[PDB]
Write an enzyme that holds these catalytic residues in place. Structure first.
Site, mmCIF file in Angstrom:
data_model
loop_
_atom_site.group_PDB
_atom_site.id
_atom_site.type_symbol
_atom_site.label_atom_id
_atom_site.label_comp_id
_atom_site.label_asym_id
_atom_site.label_seq_id
_atom_site.Cartn_x
_atom_site.Cartn_y
_atom_site.Cartn_z
ATOM 1 N N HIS A 166 0.848 -1.218 -0.083
ATOM 2 C CA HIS A 166 0.145 -0.045 -0.044
ATOM 3 C C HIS A 166 0.795 1.328 0.012
ATOM 4 C CE1 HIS A 166 -2.843 -2.968 1.610
ATOM 5 N NE2 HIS A 166 -3.670 -2.368 0.917
ATOM 6 N N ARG A 176 2.766 7.815 -12.478
ATOM 7 C CA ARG A 176 1.285 8.318 -12.468
ATOM 8 C C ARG A 176 0.328 7.909 -13.362
ATOM 9 N NH1 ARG A 176 1.129 11.958 -8.095
ATOM 10 N NH2 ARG A 176 -0.988 11.594 -7.984
ATOM 11 N N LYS A 217 -3.660 -9.227 -9.047
ATOM 12 C CA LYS A 217 -4.600 -8.853 -8.066
ATOM 13 C C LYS A 217 -5.425 -7.619 -8.542
ATOM 14 C CE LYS A 217 -3.757 -7.115 -3.752
ATOM 15 N NZ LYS A 217 -3.332 -7.175 -2.525
ATOM 16 N N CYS A 224 -5.209 1.429 -9.011
ATOM 17 C CA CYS A 224 -4.848 0.752 -10.484
ATOM 18 C C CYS A 224 -5.828 -0.354 -10.535
ATOM 19 C CB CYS A 224 -3.655 0.076 -10.375
ATOM 20 S SG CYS A 224 -2.241 1.437 -9.940
ATOM 21 N N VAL A 232 -7.650 8.531 3.050
ATOM 22 C CA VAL A 232 -7.506 7.244 3.179
ATOM 23 C C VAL A 232 -8.626 6.520 4.475
ATOM 24 C CG1 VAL A 232 -5.238 7.208 2.261
ATOM 25 C CG2 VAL A 232 -5.493 6.979 5.030
ATOM 26 N N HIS A 254 -4.011 -2.301 6.690
ATOM 27 C CA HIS A 254 -5.265 -2.780 5.553
ATOM 28 C C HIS A 254 -5.834 -1.315 5.264
ATOM 29 C CE1 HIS A 254 -8.031 -4.889 3.156
ATOM 30 N NE2 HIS A 254 -8.857 -4.438 3.988
#
Lengths: 185, 141, 25, 55, 120
Positions: free
Chosen positions: E10, E18, E37, E78, E100, E111
């Site tokens: 993360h 970018r 993933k 992404c 976030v 997480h």
RNA sequence: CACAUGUUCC
RNA sequence: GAAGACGGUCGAACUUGACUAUCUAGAGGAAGUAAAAGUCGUAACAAGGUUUCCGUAGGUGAACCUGCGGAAGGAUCAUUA
RNA sequence: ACGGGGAAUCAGGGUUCGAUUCCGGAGAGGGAGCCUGAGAAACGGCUACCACAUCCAAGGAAGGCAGCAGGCGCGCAAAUUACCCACUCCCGACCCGGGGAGGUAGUGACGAAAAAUAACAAUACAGGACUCUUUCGAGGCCCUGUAAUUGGAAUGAGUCCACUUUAAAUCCUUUAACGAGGAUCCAUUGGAGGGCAAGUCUGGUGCCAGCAGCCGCGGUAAUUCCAGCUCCAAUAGCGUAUAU
């Protein structure tokens, strides 16, 4: 201080390249045509050829009329003609270089059993050596690598104690007979 | 040669005695300092006590976790990173067990994929690792 | 890297390895 | 991690090695080899087949 | 172990690029593309402010054990596109400046659920 | 007059 | 003619001290190499954006910069009465 | 680092080895000193110190396997606490006595020499030389090979006696009896991407486990991992490590 030999000589030489196609074929043609048991005795016969050819090569480097060349030359040619490798008509030291590997391969006893026509096969010929079925000069030979000389060529024959010669019939006939009369009463 | 005198055999002997030292393969064996850094000491094998099973990672894109063993020598007392040779044989080797470590074959050089290791285990507890992988001999528990 | 300052860094570090040694001796 | 040791060897499915006729050892191993290297081959145009070749 | 796993899955200090390529290159540099993933997010900035999210220093509380960031940072979401979850993995990028929603444990984020906007 | 850097399984 | 004593000799060994060989602990300082794909900035490779390089001095986070003397392995084998 | 004859490798030249049965040197824990005798600074002879170590009644006494075995330890690394003076020889006062020098067996894939693990025929089948036939096909005067097809013929591993062998044996060789049809009495060890002889076989595995001396292979259709089938080299040996 114990009295024994401690003298060892390896009778064969393994080749330098182990995995090339060219040398692999030639020895396969020599095993199958002459009934050999491995590739070792190919190079073993090729080793004793390298001993005689080198002993012949250095004699040429000694000049002519030399007694050592005259003695050891004639001593070497004495044995080559007595074992059926070189004929009387080519008795000279120059001819040893042109002597090839298959030339000693005739003088194995196993070939002489398929040469004299008392074996159905060259591969059946070795078993007649193994089972003590043939003798040479009233002496049985249980080894196929016996190098027969030129003199005993007419003395090759079946052994005295052999069902395939003038001896007792074997175990299979003595077993096929016990039921041949034991089944008939 | 370059100096071709009739009685220059001394100068011709000293050079192949002096310049012989500039040979790398010669200077390794004719100087015991390499035999000092040698953990074995000129031996074909060595026995030792295993104390841990390391995992040493590869370097090149042939990247994987090579299963190695940190052995402690029982003739000199050094500590050596051995290597469990075969696939999935780390379960056969147990902890604090005597092992027969040997050279890898390249004789004192990190052998490609594995970094900084020259040593592999061939036996454990007088039992070979071929027989264990083939299952012909097992560990007696 | 130049072979000139790699000689110079090996000269300032060389003068250090003596100057930390002389006072101990 | 060292928990993944012997990953494939346990999960590779077994195949019972099926019984097959033993090859004749000794010089007869060379007697049968010499046969199918010189005496049975026919001149066949096309590329020379490998001893294990199959596609 | 759980903390550095967050900083691999993360976190990335400076996002060189970018774009869609950069999303497709950061995801196999960490070991996240075996298998590929489906979607993942990466934070940028300094770690002390990311560490400030566990308390009311720069963090408000959100459902069971999660926390919203008070001040926002830059993130990159992404999205894998293509019906094969096996490589080569094809990602599309999204720039932005968002908050976030992390679920931190013992003072350390492990997480990150969502990257939101403040209020409409 | 200034103009630095690179992501590469293939 | 023994034990023993006196002297002399060879002289092991022991205490101590010097010399030397090998291996090894050390706070701490300082390199090297490798594992990652970390931070900083572009020195080199194209005139690599101030041509590069060598010796020698001084300086600067880091590459490196500058002085002085060279060198072409330079971007000129040449530019004219 | 015991020297030398010598051993291993090699075209030629050399490089390396030589503790190891032959000669000679040197020494029997470590050094020192001596007795006796032609000959010893002897150690299966003494006298000290030093280390190690045995029994005691505690006063003492005694020790030296770098001899044959054997035991621990050291180790990567090395045999039986066997039989006998018959052979070899040596010693003595000596035809006789003695000799763990020595000889004979036992352990012994250090190593070397030789050498098994089959042979034939018939048939069914693929195929090669001939004549007929522009092919198909054919008989086979002549073969080559294969096919848990059938068929007898021949042996030695081994069981086994007898002699032989020998000091007494054992083994070798000899002789009688048995003794293989899938002669189940069943040959392995390494490899099958290249280097380097040998499947683009099949499934599992999915940059994981691992392989591979080197280069390199694995990220989901692996010619390189793991299995089976097949195949390749050497063959009672072969791989690996390390020395050269």
């Amino acid at each position: 201080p114990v009295a024994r030999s401690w003298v060892c000589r390896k009778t064969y030489v393994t080749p330098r390249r182990p995995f090339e196609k060219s040398r692999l074929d030639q020895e396969l043609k020599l095993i199958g045509e002459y009934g050999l048991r491995n590739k070792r005795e190919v190079w073993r016969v090729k080793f004793t050829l390298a001993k005689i050819r080198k002993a012949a090569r250095e004699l040429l480097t000694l000049d002519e009329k030399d007694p050592r060349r005259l003695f050891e030359g004639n001593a070497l040619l004495r044995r080559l003609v007595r074992i059926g490798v070189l004929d009387e008509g080519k008795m000279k030291l120059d001819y040893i270089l042109g002597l090839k590997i298959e030339d000693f391969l005739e003088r194995r006893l196993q070939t002489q059993v398929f040469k004299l026509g008392l074996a159905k096969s060259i591969h059946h010929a070795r078993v007649l050596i193994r089972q003590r079925h043939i003798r040479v000069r009233k002496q049985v030979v249980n080894i196929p690598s016996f190098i027969v000389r030129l003199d005993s060529q007419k003395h090759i024959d079946f052994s005295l104690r052999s069902p395939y010669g003038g001896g007792r019939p074997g175990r299979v006939k003595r077993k096929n007979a016990k039921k041949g009369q034991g089944g008939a009463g | 040669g370059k100096c071709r005198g009739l009685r220059t055999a001394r100068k011709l002997r000293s050079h192949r005695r002096d310049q012989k030292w500039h040979d790398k393969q010669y200077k390794k064996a004719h100087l015991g300092t390499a035999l000092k850094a040698n953990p074995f000491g000129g031996a074909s094998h060595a026995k030792g006590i295993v104390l841990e099973k390391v995992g040493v990672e590869a370097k090149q894109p042939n990247s994987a976790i090579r299963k190695c063993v940190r052995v402690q020598l029982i003739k000199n007392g050094k500590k050596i990173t051995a290597f469990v040779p075969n696939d999935g044989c780390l379960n056969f080797i147990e902890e604090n067990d005597e092992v027969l470590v040997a050279g890898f074959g390249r004789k004192g050089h990190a052998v490609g994929d594995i970094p900084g290791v020259r040593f592999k285990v061939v036996k454990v507890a007088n039992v070979s690792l071929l027989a264990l992988y083939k299952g012909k001999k097992e560990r007696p528990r | 890297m130049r072979a000139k300052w790699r000689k110079k860094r090996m000269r300032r570090l060389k003068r250090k390895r003596r100057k930390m040694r002389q006072r101990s001796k | 991690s060292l928990a993944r040791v012997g990953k494939v060897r346990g999960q590779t499915l077994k195949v019972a090695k099926q019984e097959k006729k033993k090859k004749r050892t000794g010089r007869a191993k060379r007697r049968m080899q010499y046969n199918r290297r010189f005496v049975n081959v026919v001149p066949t145009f096309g590329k020379k087949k490998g001893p294990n070749a199959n596609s | 172990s759980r903390y550095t796993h967050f900083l691999t899955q993360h976190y990335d200090a400076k996002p060189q690029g970018r774009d869609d390529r950069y999303c497709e290159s950061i995801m196999r540099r960490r070991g996240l593309t075996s298998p590929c993933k489906d979607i993942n997010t990466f934070i940028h900035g300094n770690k002390r402010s990311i560490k400030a999210i566990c308390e009311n220093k720069n963090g408000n509380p959100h459902r069971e054990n999660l926390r919203i960031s008070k001040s926002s940072f830059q993130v990159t979401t992404c999205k894998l596109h293509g019906g094969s979850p096996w490589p080569p993995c094809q990602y599309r990028a999204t720039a932005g400046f968002r908050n976030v929603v992390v679920a931190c444990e013992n003072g350390l984020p492990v997480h990150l659920d969502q990257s939101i906007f403040r209020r409409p």
